[PDB]
Amino acid sequence: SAHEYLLSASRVLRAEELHEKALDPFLLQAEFFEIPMNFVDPKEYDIPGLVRKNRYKTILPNPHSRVRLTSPDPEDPLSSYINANYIRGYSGEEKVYIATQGPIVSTVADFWRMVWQERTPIIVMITNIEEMNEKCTEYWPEEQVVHDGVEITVQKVIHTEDYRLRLISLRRGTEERTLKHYWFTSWPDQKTPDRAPPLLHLVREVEEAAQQEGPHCSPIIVHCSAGIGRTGCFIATSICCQQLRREGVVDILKTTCQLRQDRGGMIQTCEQYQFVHHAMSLYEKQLSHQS
Numbered sequence: 001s002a003h004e005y006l007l008s009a010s011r012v013l014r015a016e017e018l019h020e021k022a023l024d025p026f027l028l029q030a031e032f033f034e035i036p037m038n039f040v041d042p043k044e045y046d047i048p049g050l051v052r053k054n055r056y057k058t059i060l061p062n063p064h065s066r067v068r069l070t071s072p073d074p075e076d077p078l079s080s081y082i083n084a085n086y087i088r089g090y091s092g093e094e095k096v097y098i099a100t101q102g103p104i105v106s107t108v109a110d111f112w113r114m115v116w117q118e119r120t121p122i123i124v125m126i127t128n129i130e131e132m133n134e135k136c137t138e139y140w141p142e143e144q145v146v147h148d149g150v151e152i153t154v155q156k157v158i159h160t161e162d163y164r165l166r167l168i169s170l171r172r173g174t175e176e177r178t179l180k181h182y183w184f185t186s187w188p189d190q191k192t193p194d195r196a197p198p199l200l201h202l203v204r205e206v207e208e209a210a211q212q213e214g215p216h217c218s219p220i221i222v223h224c225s226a227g228i229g230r231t232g233c234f235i236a237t238s239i240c241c242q243q244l245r246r247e248g249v250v251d252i253l254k255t256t257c258q259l260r261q262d263r264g265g266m267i268q269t270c271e272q273y274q275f276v277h278h279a280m281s282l283y284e285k286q287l288s289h290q291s
């Protein structure tokens, strides 16, 4: 009955309701704990054989939206597998994002094969610097590296207060591509409203960069550690910004349900759920300040 709940659950919020809702743990908790996680039944996968590709045995990609790696390799039976899902965006548009776990030593090459296959123009990495080499490895070179005949070069490193932006070139055969890599370093320990502005600013900077891709922007890869918590927060904020700007309302509950349908467990905790409301409440204030 979880599928039907996720299809119909909705809580349209107007501006005044949104500011109050963000500061209402009583209403937020009751709403959040009613949402099914939609975790994949482990029977869908050969759990013992995938231990080197999955960070957590209970966090699996929902088969229907799973990102399949089509590049051939007959020697490796796991070359087609990656713990990643296609995520619908604003107005249910298909493949707007890819939510995936932070690459591990054994999945760095798989991650770059996904980047190439999908023609990904933007990668959003959500961490803290103290979590490095643990919650996420440094899968990019200092200057240049070759993965699966794909030359990966870091052309520029742009340091900002809350993120490091890398301009990356990708080359294989006669093809040459560009990539924007946003390494967000200000994910907070405590999801208080004063910590929401860097997340909203990153969301809006990424949106402006996606606009520059023109129509038919290829999937934006978003990753944290398990690829559901912080990833869910970023993506829900990204979708709800477009909804607030175009419809003058936000439906965080419906957005969270659409995310859960695509990948089980998107937005893991009620603190993360409230954080999205804090970010949306702040965006409404920013919009009112130019109105």
Ligand SMILES: N=C(N)Nc1cc(C2CCNCC2)cc(C(F)(F)F)c1
Pocket (backbone or CB within 6 Å): 089, 093, 095, 096, 206, 207, 208, 210, 211, 216, 217, 218, 220, 238, 239
């Ligand atoms: N719709 C897609 N395939 N990509 C995609 C396009 C957009 C643009 C933003 C400007 N309005 C038109 C849509 C924004 C984003 C995102 F916010 F995530 F960054 C992703």
